[PDB]
């Protein structure tokens, strides 16, 4: 798919002794890519009678949400490929190793601003659960108290958590 | 043998254009600069052009 | 494509009176002593912009104070501003990622701001604190302001905009030197040298301060 | 069962594939997408980082 993209440049001098010069536009591309995926499987029939119950009613059954737990496994493999390794991206990428600093409470207020001047158009967040843990721990007051709150707490700060 | 996919031709698409929009938003206003006075206004309407009062 | 560029002239001109506006600051308060009392540097290492420094900012006009308002922003600054701005009382974690007002005064945030650039990776910051309201300016017109003409044995097709406007702050009074011309001035040539202030002491009124991001 | 997915975003590009189509699992992970936009507008951010000590 092609895109059009927006003009730009300088006004000029306007001036005698000498004449203007009109500009032009650029136009850019865009592509994507189709997949497709199926698996099988299968039984035994004297197996089936001998054990007392049916395998194949109950695989069957049980078939319908093994694709979800598929389409995440491709999900979290073209995330990692999209920002693989590539300089271009390093804008949208931070990185806290070299063993200081935790993830707390200012590195997440890093991250939220990344985008300099769009912003709040980020709203939900992605965790693990010792992160989350880790999170908690830090969250407790000193006011107030030990103990009341707490452990799970959506949201974080004015942004869904999963 | 088989059909083949090497064999019945495979077509392409296209969509129309879309018009794609440069951001750095700009604004910096409102502020100085604003509020047009009427002297500045003796610069900017003919006649007595420029170049610029005291 | 006529139709689309067409289409998208209109906000075009905006960031360009923008980019002429940062240009006649930075050569109004460029390297004239005679300015000195509204501007202060945070430059040596020392100095993070917090909580006090904007203080000195705020009173830099002595007496005269509230004449200020609004403030000028780049994104990495309000970021720092909030990591400081994290209570121990309360809380992890409730508020909070944007915050106008700052103290009594409004805020726009920015992307493009003077940005310098030392060695030893070092930036540099500038946020203009203005809160003026404000220098001024005026339309005017020329004649012929939109007009469309083509080659007729090539093919093409054109359009021209060909607008003037007067801006100055009042303000240090302008001088004539070390210009070619004439007139208008130019960009880089309006933002060279040799403007001379004459009021002086207040209601000007707009002061700049560098610093360094936090750590 | 087939479905197409991808960002937009980055620019698939051709290369270092087998095929075709469609690409694989490990081949869809392994190397050169290319972006056009670019600033901003994409919209996803990562950041790594350790554990509270």
Do not use: C
């Amino acid at each position: 798919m092609p895109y059009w993209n927006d003009l730009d440049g300088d006004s000029q001098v306007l001036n005698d002794t000498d004449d203007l010069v009109p500009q032009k536009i650029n136009a850019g591309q865009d592509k994507a890519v189709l997949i497709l995926r199926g698996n099988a499987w299968s039984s035994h029939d004297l197996a089936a009678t001998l054990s007392g119950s049916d395998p194949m009613q109950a695989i069957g059954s049980r078939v319908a949400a093994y694709w979800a737990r598929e389409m995440q496994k491709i999900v979290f493999a073209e995330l990692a490929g999209v920002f693989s390794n590539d300089d271009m991206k390093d804008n949208k990428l931070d990185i806290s190793g070299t063993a200081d600093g935790i993830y707390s409470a200012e590195t997440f207020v890093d991250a939220s601003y990344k985008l300099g001047d769009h912003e709040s158009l980020l709203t939900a967040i992605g965790m693990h659960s010792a992160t989350m843990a880790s999170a908690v721990k830090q969250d407790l007051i000193e006011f107030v108290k030990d103990s009341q709150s707490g452990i799970r707490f959506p949201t974080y700060m004015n942004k869904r958590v999963i | 043998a088989y059909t083949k996919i090497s064999d019945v031709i495979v077509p392409e698409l296209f969509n129309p254009y879309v018009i794609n929009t440069t951001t750095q938003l700009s604004a910096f206003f409102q502020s100085g600069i604003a509020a047009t006075d009427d002297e500045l206004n003796a610069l900017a309407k003919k006649a007595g052009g420029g170049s610029t009062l005291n | 494509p006529m139709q689309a560029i067409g289409s998208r002239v209109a906000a075009y001109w905006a960031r360009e009176m923008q980019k002429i506006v940062f240009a006649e600051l930075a050569g109004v308060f460029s390297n004239d002593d005679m300015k000195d009392n509204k501007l202060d540097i945070s430059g040596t290492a020392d100095g993070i912009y917090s909580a006090e420094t904007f203080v000195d900012a705020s009173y830099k006009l002595g007496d005269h104070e509230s004449l200020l308002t609004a403030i000028g922003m780049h994104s990495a600054t309000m970021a720092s501003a909030v990591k400081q701005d994290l209570i121990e009382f309360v809380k992890d974690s409730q508020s909070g990622i944007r915050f106008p007002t700052y103290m009594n005064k409004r805020v726009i945030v920015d992307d493009s701001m003077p940005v310098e650039t030392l060695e030893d990776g070092t930036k540099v910051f500038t946020s203009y604190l203005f809160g003026a309201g404000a220098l001024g300016y005026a339309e005017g017109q020329p004649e012929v302001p939109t007009e469309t003409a083509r080659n007729a044995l090539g093919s093409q097709d054109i359009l021209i905009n060909r607008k003037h406007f007067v801006l100055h702050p009042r303000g240090v009074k302008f001088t004539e030197n070390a210009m070619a011309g004439t007139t208008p001035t130019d960009e880089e040539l309006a933002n060279g040298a040799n403007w001379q202030r004459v009021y002086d002491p207040k209601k000007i009124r707009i002061v700049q301060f560098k610093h360094r991001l936090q750590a």
